[PDB]
C-alpha cells in the first residue's frame, strides 16, 4: 500500500494541533479554535483585604466622622494615620446625636487627608464654663461629651459675647471642627445659655460663615431630643481665625492637620488578612496581572479597568485543525 | 465579439453573473460556458454576515439620564453637565469612525484574499497541465471538454492520466 | 490511522509535534522525518508575547474617586455621579471587546501567513528539482537520504549538482 520509490521523497511540512482546543472569538467569526486561550478578566476574588503595601485601618463599628469628633468607643483611633480607611456596615453612633450639612463633602476631604493628628490648643475662654457633658455620651461609665469638642455654659447665669481669636503661622493648613447646639425649648435656651436668642459667626481672611440656631422639637434618639450641627473651616497659612458668638457654640479644642496624598475611604465588610497584593475591592483583594476585571466598580490602587463582560478569551497560539477521521 | 476570456481577478470583473460571487469562464471547441462556485462565496458572505449580526440589533437599555438641554443658565453644575455630555459624544463619534474604517479594510482585504486562494487552488491542481499569464486565465492541456471543467470544479481532476499529453505543448 | 505522508498546513494539524510549532516530515528511502524546525516557531512566538507583555502588567494608578453606590436618594448630583460612571464602564467595556477581537484576528492571520512564507521559502529553495501535488507536500526526485533532506532545512541545497536526476523524473 505505501507505494514509494527509493528516490521519490515528500518533505511534507505542517504545524501542530491539540485534541482539545479553546473556544475564542475573533472579528470575522465567533467560534474559531485556537490551541490555548488566556483569560483577560479577573472574575475571582480572594475574599479578604491585606495591608501589605498600604496601611489599612479597620472600622470596628466606628465611622470616620465619629472618630473625628471623638466618640467614647471610637477613642482608639486618636492621631492614627492611614492609607485607606475601611468602613463597616455595622457602624452605629453611640453619643450625642448630630448631623452635618454636606455630609459627603466632610467625609471625602478628611479621608483624602488620611491623618487624624490633632493638637490641643489653649483658647482664651473668659466668662464661660467649659467641659460640658451629656448623659447620652458615656465614657468609662461616666457622663462625657465629644472628645475633640467643648460645650459651653454660663457661670453666674451670664453669657458674655466671645471675641476669641488665634492666628496661623505654620506652613501647612489648619482644619477646625466647630458646631452649634440646637435646644429643644425656649426654657432650655435660657437655662443653658442665659440668653433668649443666639448667633455664631466665624470668619477668616477670605471667607466667613454665619449660623442662626434653629430652636424646636426633634425625634428622640438615645433619650435626647436636641441636635448639633457641625461645620468645618479651612484656615490658610498666615490667616486669622476670628470667632464671635453669643451662645449655642460648640468650642473646638484645636486643629487637625491636613495634606494631599493617596488616602481614601471605602465601605466594605471584608475581613483583614495577610497576603501580598495591591488591588483593594469591597469583595476583597484581586490579582492585578489581568488587564480587566468585573468584580466591582469600586477599587483602589493599581487595579485593572472595570468591564461588564463575564469572560474575554485572548488567543495565544494558532488555528486548530485536529482529527481528520483519526 | 472579441471573446478571449479577457479578464477576471485582474483588470475588470463580471457583471452578467448574479447567482454567485465568484465564477469561471472557459473557451474551447464546445464554446463558452459560465458557472459560479458556491464554496468560495460562502466564506466571503459568512464574514460579511458576521459583521451585520454583531452590530445590528446589539443595543443596551438606558433608562434615566441627566438633562441634556437647559432653557435656563446656571454656574458650575450646568457647565459640568454640558462638559460630560460633550465628551461622551466626541468619544462615541470617534469610536464609530474607527470602527467602520477598520471593518471596511478587513472586508476588502479578506474578499481579495479569500478568492485569491480560489485562483491558487486551481493552479496547484494544474501543476504541469497548464500555464499561467497576466490576465488570470490558463492554458489547460489536454483538450478540455465539458468533463475537465466539471472535474476541476468538483476537484476530481487527475494530472497523471493526461501528464504525458500535456508535455508536448510544454516541449514546444 | 496509518503513516502515509499526511498533508500539512492547508489540510491537517499534526499531534506529535510538541517541541516545535512548524516542523517538517519527510518520507524517503528510510521513511520517517517528523522533526522540529527553528526561526519559524520563535517568529510566531515573538508576536505572541509582545501582545502579552503590553497587555499584562500595564496598570495605571487610581487612588481617590467619587462614591459609586449610594444609600440615600438625592438630586442632580447623585444622578450625575451615577451617569458619569455608567458612561465610563460602557466605553471601557467596548474598548475591551474591540481590542481583544482585533488582537485575535492579527494573531491568526500572522500565524497562517508565517507558515505560508515558510512553505514558499522551501518552494523557492528547490527551483525545478521538485513540484507539489497541492496539499502542502513536495515531490522530490533524485537520491535524497536524511542528510539530503536535512540540508534543505538548514539552507544549503544546490539545484545544479542535482539537475541531471531532477529532469529525468520530470518533463522528460
Amino acid at each position, epitope marked *: *500500500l505505501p507505494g*514509494n520509490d527509493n528516490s521519490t521523497a515528500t518533505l511534507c511540512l505542517g504545524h501542530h494541533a491539540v485534541p482539545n482546543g479553546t473556544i475564542v472569538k475573533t472579528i470575522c467569526n465567533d467560534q474559531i479554535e485556537v490551541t490555548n486561550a488566556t483569560e483577560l478578566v479577573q472574575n475571582s476574588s480572594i475574599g479578604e483585604i491585606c495591608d501589605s503595601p498600604h496601611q489599612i485601618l479597620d472600622g470596628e463599628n466606628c465611622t470616620l466622622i465619629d472618630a473625628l469628633l471623638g466618640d467614647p468607643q471610637c477613642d482608639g483611633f486618636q492621631n492614627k494615620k492611614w492609607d485607606l480607611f475601611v468602613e463597616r456596615s455595622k457602624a452605629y453612633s453611640n453619643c450625642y446625636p448630630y448631623d452635618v450639612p454636606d455630609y459627603a463633602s466632610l467625609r471625602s476631604l478628611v479621608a483624602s487627608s488620611g491623618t487624624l493628628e490633632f493638637n490641643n490648643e489653649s483658647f482664651n475662654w473668659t466668662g464661660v464654663t467649659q467641659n460640658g457633658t451629656s448623659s447620652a455620651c458615656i465614657r468609662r461609665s461616666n457622663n462625657s461629651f465629644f472628645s475633640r469638642l467643648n460645650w459651653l455654659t454660663q457661670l453666674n447665669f451670664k453669657y458674655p459675647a466671645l471675641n476669641v481669636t488665634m492666628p496661623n503661622n505654620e506652613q501647612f493648613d489648619k482644619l477646625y471642627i466647630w458646631g452649634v447646639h440646637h435646644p429643644v425649648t425656649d426654657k432650655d435656651q435660657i437655662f443653658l445659655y442665659a440668653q433668649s436668642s443666639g448667633r455664631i459667626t466665624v470668619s477668616t481672611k477670605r471667607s466667613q460663615q454665619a449660623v442662626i440656631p434653629n430652636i424646636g422639637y426633634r425625634p428622640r434618639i438615645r433619650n435626647i431630643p436636641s441636635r448639633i450641627s457641625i461645620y468645618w473651616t479651612i484656615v490658610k497659612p498666615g490667616d486669622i481665625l476670628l470667632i464671635n458668638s453669643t451662645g449655642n457654640l460648640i468650642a473646638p479644642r484645636g486643629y487637625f492637620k491636613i495634606r494631599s496624598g493617596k488616602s481614601s475611604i471605602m465601605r466594605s465588610d471584608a475581613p483583614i488578612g495577610k497576603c501580598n497584593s495591591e488591588c483593594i475591592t469591597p469583595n476583597g483583594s484581586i490579582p492585578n496581572d489581568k488587564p480587566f476585571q468585573n468584580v466591582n466598580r469600586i477599587t483602589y490602587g493599581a487595579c485593572p479597568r472595570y468591564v461588564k463582560q463575564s469572560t474575554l478569551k485572548l488567543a495565544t497560539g494558532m488555528r486548530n485543525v485536529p482529527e481528520k477521521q483519526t | 465579439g472579441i471573446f478571449g476570456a479577457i479578464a477576471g481577478f485582474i483588470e475588470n470583473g463580471w457583471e452578467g453573473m448574479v447567482d454567485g460571487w465568484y465564477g469561471f469562464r472557459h473557451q474551447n471547441s464546445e464554446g463558452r460556458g459560465q458557472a459560479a462556485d458556491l464554496k468560495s462565496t460562502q466564506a466571503a458572505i459568512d464574514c460579511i454576515n458576521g459583521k451585520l449580526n454583531r452590530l445590528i440589533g446589539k443595543t443596551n437599555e438606558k433608562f434615566h439620564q441627566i438633562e441634556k438641554e437647559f432653557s435656563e443658565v446656571e454656574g458650575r453644575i450646568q457647565d459640568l453637565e454640558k462638559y460630560v455630555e460633550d465628551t461622551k459624544i466626541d468619544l462615541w463619534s470617534y469610536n464609530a469612525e474607527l470602527l467602520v474604517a477598520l471593518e471596511n479594510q478587513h472586508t476588502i482585504d479578506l474578499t481579495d484574499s479569500e478568492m485569491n486562494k480560489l485562483f491558487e487552488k486551481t493552479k496547484k491542481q494544474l501543476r504541469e497541465n497548464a500555464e499561467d499569464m497576466g490576465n488570470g486565465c490558463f492554458k489547460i492541456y489536454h483538450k478540455c471538454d465539458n468533463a475537465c471543467i466539471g472535474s476541476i470544479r468538483n476537484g476530481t481532476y487527475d494530472h497523471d492520466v493526461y501528464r504525458d499529453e500535456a508535455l508536448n505543448n510544454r516541449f514546444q | *490511522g496509518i503513516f502515509g505522508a499526511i498533508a500539512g498546513f492547508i489540510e491537517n494539524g499534526w499531534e506529535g509535534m510538541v517541541d516545535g510549532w512548524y516542523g517538517f516530515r519527510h518520507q524517503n528511502s528510510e521513511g520517517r522525518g517528523q522533526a522540529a524546525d527553528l526561526k519559524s516557531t520563535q517568529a510566531a512566538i515573538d508576536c505572541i508575547n509582545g501582545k502579552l507583555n503590553r497587555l499584562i502588567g500595564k496598570t495605571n494608578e487610581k487612588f481617590h474617586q467619587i462614591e459609586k453606590e449610594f444609600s440615600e436618594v438625592e438630586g442632580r448630583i447623585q444622578d450625575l455621579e451615577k451617569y458619569v460612571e455608567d458612561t465610563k464602564i460602557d466605553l471601557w467595556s467596548y474598548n475591551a471587546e474591540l481590542l481583544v477581537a482585533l488582537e485575535n484576528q492579527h494573531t491568526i492571520d500572522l500565524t497562517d501567513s508565517e507558515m505560508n512564507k515558510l512553505f514558499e521559502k522551501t518552494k523557492k529553495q528547490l527551483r525545478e528539482n521538485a513540484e507539489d501535488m497541492g496539499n502542502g507536500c513536495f515531490k522530490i526526485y533524485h537520491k535524497c537520504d536524511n542528510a539530503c533532506i536535512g540540508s534543505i532545512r538548514n539552507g544549503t541545497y544546490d539545484h545544479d549538482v542535482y539537475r541531471d536526476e531532477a529532469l529525468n523524473n520530470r518533463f522528460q
Partner: antibody, heavy 122, light 110 residues
C-alpha cells in the same frame, strides 16, 4: 509455512447471523504490513471481496454490505473473526480467508485458505 | 459501483502466449488501483500471481508477468504450460474496497 484455515457452521437458517473464524499459522498480526482478508465465492458466479483488517486496526469493507458486515481480529491467539447479519440465499457461498501482504508498490494477494462451504436454507 | 470486466474465456496451445486484461468502468486504470491477479485450479487452492500491478509474488514461475497496457491492466503468460488450465481473476482497489472481476477461463489443450 504459511497456512490458513476457515471454520463455520455450514448450515444456517434464513435471517440468522453468520459467524466465521479464520485460523492461520506461520505469521502474526503484530508485524507491520500484515493483514487478512475475506473473499467469498457463491459456487458458480464470480468472486466477491468482503473486507480485510490491517495490523493497525484499520477497517475497510464493501460499501454494499457495510451495515451487515463486522470483522475483527485477535492478535494473542492469531484469529480472524467475521460476522454477517441477516443472511439470505444470496449469502450461500464458499468463504475464503486469505493473507494480504502490504509492501511498497501495492498489496500482494499471496496466500489463501482452503475455504469453508456455507449453505443458507430453511 | 465500479464493475470490473475481463474476457470470458481464452484458449491456447502448450507454449503459446496469452495476454489477459483487467478493465475498469470508472475510467483509467493506474498503479494506484493495485491490480491483483489470482489463479484458481480446480483441485488446488487460490494462489496469487501479481500484486501492485508490477510486483510478483515469490514462488510462481517466470512465465507470469503483469504490466499496464494502455488504459487497462494486464497479465501476460509467455509460454503457457499444461498446468495453467485454471481460472483467473483480477481485483482492483477503488480507495475504499476491492472489486473482483468476472474471471477468465484459460484453457490449454492437453
Amino acid at each position: 509455512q504459511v497456512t490458513l484455515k476457515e471454520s463455520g457452521p455450514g448450515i444456517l437458517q434464513p435471517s440468522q447471523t453468520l459467524s466465521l473464524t479464520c485460523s492461520f499459522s506461520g505469521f502474526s498480526l503484530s508485524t507491520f504490513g500484515m493483514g487478512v482478508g475475506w473473499i467469498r465465492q457463491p459456487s458458480g458466479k464470480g468472486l466477491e471481496w468482503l473486507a480485510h483488517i490491517w495490523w493497525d486496526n484499520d477497517e475497510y469493507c464493501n460499501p454494499a454490505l457495510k451495515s451487515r458486515l463486522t470483522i475483527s481480529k485477535d492478535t494473542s491467539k492469531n484469529h480472524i473473526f467475521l460476522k454477517i447479519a441477516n443472511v439470505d440465499t444470496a449469502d450461500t457461498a464458499t468463504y475464503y480467508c486469505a493473507r494480504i501482504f502490504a509492501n511498497y508498490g501495492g498489496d500482494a494477494m499471496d496466500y489463501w485458505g482452503q475455504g469453508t462451504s456455507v449453505t443458507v436454507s430453511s | 459501483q465500479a464493475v470490473v470486466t475481463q474476457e470470458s474465456a481464452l484458449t491456447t496451445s502448450p507454449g503459446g502466449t496469452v495476454i489477459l486484461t483487467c478493465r475498469s468502468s470508472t475510467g483509467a486504470v493506474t498503479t494506484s488501483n493495485y491490480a491483483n491477479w489470482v489463479q484458481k485450479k480446480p483441485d488446488h487452492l487460490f494462489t496469487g500471481l501479481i500484486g501492485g500491478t508490477s510486483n510478483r509474488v515469490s514462488g510462481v514461475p517466470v512465465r507470469f508477468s503483469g504490466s499496464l497496457i494502455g488504459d487497462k491492466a494486464a497479465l501476460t503468460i509467455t509460454g503457457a504450460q499444461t498446468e495453467d488450465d485454471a481460472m483467473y481473476f483480477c481485483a482492483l482497489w477503488f480507495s475504499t474496497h476491492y472489486v473482483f472481476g468476472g474471471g477468465t477461463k484459460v484453457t490449454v489443450l492437453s
